[PDB]
Amino acid sequence: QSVKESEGRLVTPGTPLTLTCTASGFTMSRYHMTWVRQAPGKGLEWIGIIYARNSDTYYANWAKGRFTISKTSTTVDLKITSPTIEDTATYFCARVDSDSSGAFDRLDLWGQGTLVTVSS
Amino acid sequence: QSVKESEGRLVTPGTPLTLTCTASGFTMSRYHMTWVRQAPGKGLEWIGIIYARNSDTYYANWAKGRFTISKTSTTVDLKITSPTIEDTATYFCARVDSDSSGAFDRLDLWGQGTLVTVSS
Amino acid sequence: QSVKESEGRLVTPGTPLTLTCTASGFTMSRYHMTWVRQAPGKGLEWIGIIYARNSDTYYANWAKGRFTISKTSTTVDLKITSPTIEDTATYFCARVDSDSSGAFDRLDLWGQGTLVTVSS
Amino acid sequence: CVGVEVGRGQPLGVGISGHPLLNKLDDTENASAYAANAGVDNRECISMDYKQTQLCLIGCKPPIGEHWGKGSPCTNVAVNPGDCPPLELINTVIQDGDMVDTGFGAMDFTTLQANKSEVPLDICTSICKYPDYIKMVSEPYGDSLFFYLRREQMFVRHLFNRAGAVGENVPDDLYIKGSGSTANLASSNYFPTPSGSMVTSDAQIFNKPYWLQRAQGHNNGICWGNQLFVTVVDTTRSTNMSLCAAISTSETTYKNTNFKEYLRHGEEYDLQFIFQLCKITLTADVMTYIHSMNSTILEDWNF
Amino acid sequence: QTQLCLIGCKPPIGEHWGKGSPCTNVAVNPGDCPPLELINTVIQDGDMVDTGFGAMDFTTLQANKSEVPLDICTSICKYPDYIKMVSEPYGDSLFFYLRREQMFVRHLFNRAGAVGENVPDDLYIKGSGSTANLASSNYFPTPSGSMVTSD
Amino acid sequence: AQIFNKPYWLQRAQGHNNGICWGNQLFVTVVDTTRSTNMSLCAAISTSETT
Amino acid sequence: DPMLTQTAASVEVAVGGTVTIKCQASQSIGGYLSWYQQKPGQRPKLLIYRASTLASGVPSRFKGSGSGTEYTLTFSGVECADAAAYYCQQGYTSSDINNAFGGGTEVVVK
Amino acid sequence: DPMLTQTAASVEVAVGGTVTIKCQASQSIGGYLSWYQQKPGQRPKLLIYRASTLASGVPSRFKGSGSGTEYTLTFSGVECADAAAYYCQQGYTSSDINNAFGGGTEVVVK
């Protein structure tokens, strides 16, 4: 049920960055996982998706070459290769509750979300 | 048969806390596990439950958002996220001996139990 | 999709050397991997190949006794045993997109490539 | 006509077919754990065999078949895009090159299935029609068929369920509402993979002469207008010969990219009849009757 | 499982598929599909009955040498055409014959070779990711005889 | 391949007794296993639950 | 690319009013659509999916309708804890899109 | 050993010209052949494989032909970002060969 994250860091631009995401009750090889990014003002921006047994991925149009989503049977995580200044925002990990056919982007049980920021 | 625990710690409020639980003879992928908490005065309070094959969890009503139970084939454990002052008490790990249908909350073979306390 | 490498090193002749290669989206037990080396001037030189479930290898004619390609389900890598002076060049890791019969040497999705050099 | 025969000479051999991306999801005979969720495009590669069927029909007119097919939905209801199309029986004339049914139902898959992914290849864009024995024997002349024979058999081999959206929901009074890992239900629809049994050689309906003395129509086997049709369906002699060809003949080690692969099929027939001469005397008592049968019969004679 | 018996004054005549001489409209490539032609011949002692794989040559038509088992890998499975033998003007090729045979599928497999003719892409919908590449479009069954009996 | 639901008129029994009931009794035995499906019922203690 | 715009800043509403938030889509998405409430201090929280089926632990005083390309979300009897942020979101899981499913706000209720 | 030589330095071409790069092979390789563009600052990048089928995200103004032992690669309408390095490459995956699939260059277009 509950979705857990890794604690945030104040980093420098040009350094790789990770956030792991572990779950409490369900197993992750059954359901799907996705990441969203909450920027100040409005900002609420979806990153990508990863599926359960097919283990395929689909990113955003602007997000190719910029994020790599890794998944084991115990933990899912996402990666950042080259940070740009304006990604100081809030990230979230959530479970895709779907049905026998959809895999549609309902994120039913969210994560608590931590703060990641970059500074130079 | 015998149920083993990790040794207790005197901690500060605001720090995550773990207790592993290992078994001697039986394998844990067959049976179920749960956790109870023995407070002074009366106190004897049950935390949650886990099942051997489905691996589903069910917590108490007041205990949601406050405990996450992890299980591998070798070791079960439970976790605490944000401790409050009044959880200085005694915890126990025990095996649910059940039948082909019940999974009822008989805890037949208990653990020896260690002392965990928080202080500020 | 994206293909990742390990960061380069300035080494001395007579020391073993490794480069790991991890992938982003696809799994590596399905497809094949190989390695090419980009020298200055023209230079563009292919090293070897490794297959998916057969897990066989075939090297170049001059490259026997000089490279050993290792592969797990999570990471592929290649190894150097005894470096000679003139291998200061650029290495690349790429996925063999093939069909039900070919395993022909199309390298569709390349890696970004890092700089490795030796000096005495 | 008096007696016919339909000869074959290829050996009795089974066929095979199947799709590279066939719309399966999971397996449903025994689930040790609950079914995993389905992403996008979870189809796989399955093959099967078709049901064994034989057939022979002889008539002075072409034989009339049937199949299901889409019609026009009622005007009053709002046509939502993605709703269930109408279903209506359709009577056509069979032709050489039309597929027979395969135990998957007799329906035009083109208009009724937009997936193109639920049947194997050779019936994926064509229709499959079962012959109408009811309408043909109720033709009150009997010109569609003189006599007919058929044998068929099938049995279930595997039991799948299809990936795809629930087009009609399951009611919440049939089942007790689940919880936990099974709060969301699995796919309700299934489909079986058919298979024919062993083919043998007592149950052949070919290479035998068939003398006819009567027929259930009034037309006692008379080829009106000098014409005759014969229908033959046979899936028992259906071997699929697999061949190859080599690129180079000089290399000394087996490499996969040196041989291309093709499939070819052979089928052959021959027909032998007997006809008996028949005269008709002509009177205006008779001529009105043949004028009501067919227009072109009396016109081709210059009488 | 197959049994037969033939009695005749001339030797019996067989049939099998075989490669002929193609038209030279297109130049033959290394790896083009060869043409087919029905060939008649005389049966000799040592040739093989058809075993559920088609009466075809397995030297010229199958250069891979690894698609059938060993017994027919070089020999040619022939099948006796009753059509040409009954239609002889004198009937000396045979004058008495009996046959029974049976077969059914046991397993289903793929051919691990180059796809010579791809499927036209209006017959499916292109996928992505793992299924962006098509699997092999060639299957073949493994036949198996049924129960042998004494009746 | 059934046996029952059809009468059996006997013309001559195999033994010396051609169907005579001494003592005014006769014994009929039968063993059937083609009709041995066991029905499987179940009964709830409380239907009030949601899950 | 299916796009839901939501260029609509919410109007001041009193206790017991009714609000019609309208989320329009360019391409047809079917019924696959979600809605969320975002309180500005914590994690987001979902109300309804597939435009008709509400989630657990949520009162039945929220409504769901709309089919095809345009959809809505109405409710009545606004409490004190309804000061949050709202978002409509599709589920067409395509590849070449850059959705972010954005738009939507809610004033502090008087 | 199948060898593709490519002993051909490219000729100066203007905007809109047509270039015929010819890659000849000693042994017959079938249709299994690839082509690549190498910009001199980054990773190499494919255009066409099996001499007829182009890859994704590449305009259809590049051409592919050739069968047997010799093959070609033509295009027209040369842009400004076509200053790169070209390479033909076979796929006969043999053991005793030392291919490197070398040869090929492109001038800076005027």
Residue numbers in the entry:
A (entry chain H), B (entry chain K), C (entry chain G): 1 to 120
D (entry chain D): 102 to 404
E (entry chain E): 153 to 303
F (entry chain B): 304 to 354
G (entry chain L), H (entry chain g): 1 to 110
Kindly provide excerpts from the paper associated with this entry:
The major capsid protein L1 of HPV can self-assemble into empty virus-like particles (VLPs) that are virion sized, highly immunogenic, and therefore the immunogens in several HPV vaccines, including Cervarix, Gardasil, Gardasil 9, and Cecolin3–7. Among all mAbs against HPV16 collected, rabbit mAb H16.001 is potently neutralizing with the highest affinity, recognizes an immune-dominant epitope, and can comparably react with HPV16 vaccines from various sources. An atomic model of HPV16 pseudovirus (PsV) in complex with H16.001 was obtained to demonstrate a unique binding preference for the IVRP assay. High-resolution cryo-EM density map in radial color revealed H16.001 Fabs could bind both 5-coordinated and 6-coordinated pentamer in HPV16 PsV, and thus a total of 360 Fabs engage to a T = 7 HPV16 capsid.
To elucidate the potentially binding modality of HPV16.001 that preferably suits for vaccine characterization, we prepared the immune complex (termed HPV-001) by mixing HPV16 PsV with Fab H16.001 at a molar ratio of 1:1.5 for cryo-EM analysis. To conquer these issues and improve the resolution, we extracted the twofold axis region comprising the viral asymmetric unit with a diameter of 451.2 Å as subparticle for further refinement using the localized reconstruction procedure. The backbone of the polypeptide, as well as amino acid side chains, can be clearly traced in the capsid and Fab variable domain, enabling us to build the majority of the capsid protein and the variable domain of H16.001 Fab but excluding the constant domain that was disordered density as shown in Fig. 6b. In an asymmetric unit, each fab binds across three L1 monomers (here termed chain-C, chain-D, and chain-E) with a total buried surface area of ~1183 Å2, with about 73% (~867 Å2) buried by the heavy chain. Of note, chain-D occupy a dominant role in Fab–capsid interaction with a buried surface of ~762 Å2 (64%), while for chain-C and chain-E it is only ~315 Å2 (27%) and ~106 Å2 (9%), respectively.
